[PDB]
Design an enzyme around this catalytic site. Structure first.
Site, PDB file in Angstrom:
ATOM      1  CG  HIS C  43      -0.455   0.489   2.495  1.00  0.00           C
ATOM      2  ND1 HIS C  43      -0.020  -0.399   3.458  1.00  0.00           N
ATOM      3  CD2 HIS C  43      -0.323   1.729   3.033  1.00  0.00           C
ATOM      4  CE1 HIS C  43       0.379   0.293   4.521  1.00  0.00           C
ATOM      5  NE2 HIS C  43       0.214   1.596   4.291  1.00  0.00           N
ATOM      6  CG  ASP C  99      -0.134  -3.881   2.828  1.00  0.00           C
ATOM      7  OD1 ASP C  99       0.364  -3.479   1.755  1.00  0.00           O
ATOM      8  OD2 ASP C  99      -0.438  -3.162   3.829  1.00  0.00           O
ATOM      9  CB  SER C 198       2.711   2.719   5.829  1.00  0.00           C
ATOM     10  OG  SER C 198       1.336   2.942   6.090  1.00  0.00           O
TER      11      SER C 198
HETATM   12  N1  LIG Z   1      -1.417   0.579  13.641  1.00  0.00           N
HETATM   13  C1  LIG Z   1      -2.121   1.590  13.153  1.00  0.00           C
HETATM   14  N2  LIG Z   1      -2.951   2.254  13.926  1.00  0.00           N
HETATM   15  C2  LIG Z   1      -1.948   1.997  11.608  1.00  0.00           C
HETATM   16  C3  LIG Z   1      -2.895   2.786  10.948  1.00  0.00           C
HETATM   17  C4  LIG Z   1      -2.724   3.127   9.609  1.00  0.00           C
HETATM   18  C5  LIG Z   1      -1.613   2.688   8.900  1.00  0.00           C
HETATM   19  C6  LIG Z   1      -1.451   3.079   7.420  1.00  0.00           C
HETATM   20  N3  LIG Z   1      -2.278   2.121   6.656  1.00  0.00           N
HETATM   21  C7  LIG Z   1      -3.413   2.658   6.149  1.00  0.00           C
HETATM   22  O1  LIG Z   1      -3.748   3.826   6.303  1.00  0.00           O
HETATM   23  C8  LIG Z   1      -4.258   1.720   5.305  1.00  0.00           C
HETATM   24  C9  LIG Z   1      -4.119   2.178   3.822  1.00  0.00           C
HETATM   25  C10 LIG Z   1      -5.520   1.815   3.272  1.00  0.00           C
HETATM   26  C11 LIG Z   1      -6.488   2.296   4.385  1.00  0.00           C
HETATM   27  N4  LIG Z   1      -5.652   2.000   5.549  1.00  0.00           N
HETATM   28  C12 LIG Z   1      -6.160   1.864   6.808  1.00  0.00           C
HETATM   29  O2  LIG Z   1      -5.430   1.482   7.718  1.00  0.00           O
HETATM   30  C13 LIG Z   1      -7.600   2.168   7.135  1.00  0.00           C
HETATM   31  N5  LIG Z   1      -7.719   3.102   8.279  1.00  0.00           N
HETATM   32  C14 LIG Z   1      -8.411   0.867   7.402  1.00  0.00           C
HETATM   33  C15 LIG Z   1      -8.497   0.013   6.149  1.00  0.00           C
HETATM   34  C16 LIG Z   1      -9.305   0.387   5.071  1.00  0.00           C
HETATM   35  C17 LIG Z   1      -9.365  -0.414   3.931  1.00  0.00           C
HETATM   36  C18 LIG Z   1      -8.629  -1.592   3.847  1.00  0.00           C
HETATM   37  C19 LIG Z   1      -7.822  -1.967   4.930  1.00  0.00           C
HETATM   38  C20 LIG Z   1      -7.764  -1.167   6.061  1.00  0.00           C
HETATM   39  C21 LIG Z   1      -0.663   1.902   9.542  1.00  0.00           C
HETATM   40  C22 LIG Z   1      -0.841   1.565  10.885  1.00  0.00           C
END
Ligand SMILES: NC(=[NH2+])c1ccc(CNC(=O)[C@@H]2CCCN2C(=O)[C@H](N)Cc2ccccc2)cc1
Ligand code: NA
Ligand code: NA
Lengths: 11, 29, 251
Positions: C43, C99, C198
């Protein structure tokens, strides 16, 4: 916006 | 790599970082 | 990283920063797994709902870093990408299943006190360490709160959570290619990865051979460090056959 600039050779 | 996962500034000179023992203590018993 | 602490120098010498060439900014974390291969989250590179599709020439890998924004002359090394490889069954449409992505560098990076590759787990280490309660370590330069930006690399240790508690904490469909980590609300302690973290590594130090292994990749979460929510990580061992195929076919 806050990143120090890198040596031009890398871009 | 043969040497993977061994940090030059810690494992390679037998020094421990400040919180790695927290991980060890969780690998129970 | 939320509720973490500053890293020590050399504490995560496999930590990689993915850097955008223009505008110059942090894009993601990543990890060094050999002198020419870097591991990250897919991602980080491809996420069509957000119009994200980076190509090799869009990015740089910065290795050996500690400070987030500074150019760390004589310490960090900046590398160009030869090729990106994304898992062919990465599920960006639904839940970020699988991912994971690899990046090959144009030339091998020189190892140093600050630059050194992490190990990838084989079946036994994973079986032995990937247990509820066992703690791993996540590192990155991402947000300090849900809603900075740290001065230097941040680190937090978090316990793996039982798969039913992972499942019951979210409406997103969880898969065997994921695991979750973090403290439960009654456990008191807190901490989480967040946006910007990420692609970075979830690592564990094996008590058998005292080596660090990368068991996860920071993948997704709902908010950051919320009570009753957990961070989700790509399960590196479950996707290792793909990893080895790529490196064995492409070098
Ligand atoms: N540990 C944490 N709290 C955390 C939170 C965010 C991230 C960065 N990853 C992200 O932002 C990812 C990118 C796609 C949407 N997303 C997300 O984490 C979304 N908030 C939840 C989601 C939506 C659709 C599919 C899967 C997961 C990495 C870690
Ligand atoms: Na659920
Ligand atoms: Na939480």
């Amino acid at each position: 916006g806050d990143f120090e600039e890198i040596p031009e050779e890398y871009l | 790599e043969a040497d993977c996962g061994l940090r030059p500034l810690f494992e390679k000179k037998s020094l421990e970082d400040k919180t790695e023992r927290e991980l060890l203590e969780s690998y129970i018993d | 990283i939320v509720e973490g602490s500053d890293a020590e120098i050399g504490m995560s010498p496999w930590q990689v920063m993915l850097f955008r060439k223009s505008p110059q900014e942090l894009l993601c974390g990543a990890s060094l797994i050999s002198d020419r291969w870097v591991l990250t989250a897919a991602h980080c590179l491809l996420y069509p709902p957000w119009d994200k599709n980076f190509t090799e020439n869009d990015l740089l890998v910065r290795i050996g870093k500690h400070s987030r924004t500074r150019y760390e002359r004589n310490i960090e090394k900046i590398s160009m990408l030869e090729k990106i490889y994304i898992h062919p069954r990465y599920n960006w449409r639904e839940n970020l299943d699988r991912d994971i992505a690899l990046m090959k560098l144009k030339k091998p990076v020189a190892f140093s006190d600050y630059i050194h590759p992490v190990c990838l787990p084989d079946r036994e280490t994973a079986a032995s360490l990937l247990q509820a309660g066992y703690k791993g370590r996540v590192t990155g330069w991402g947000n300090l709160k849900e809603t900075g930006q740290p001065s230097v690399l941040q680190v937090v240790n978090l316990p793996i959570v039982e798969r039913p508690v992972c499942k019951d904490s979210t409406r997103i469909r969880i898969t065997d290619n994921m695991f979750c980590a973090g403290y439960k609300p009654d456990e008191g302690k807190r901490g989480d990865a967040c946006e910007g973290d990420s692609g970075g590594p979830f690592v564990m130090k094996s008590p058998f051979n005292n080596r660090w292994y990368q068991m996860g990749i920071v993948s997704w979460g709902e908010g950051c460090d919320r009570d009753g929510k957990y961070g989700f990580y790509t399960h590196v061992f479950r996707l290792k056959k793909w990893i080895q195929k790529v490196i064995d076919q492409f070098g």
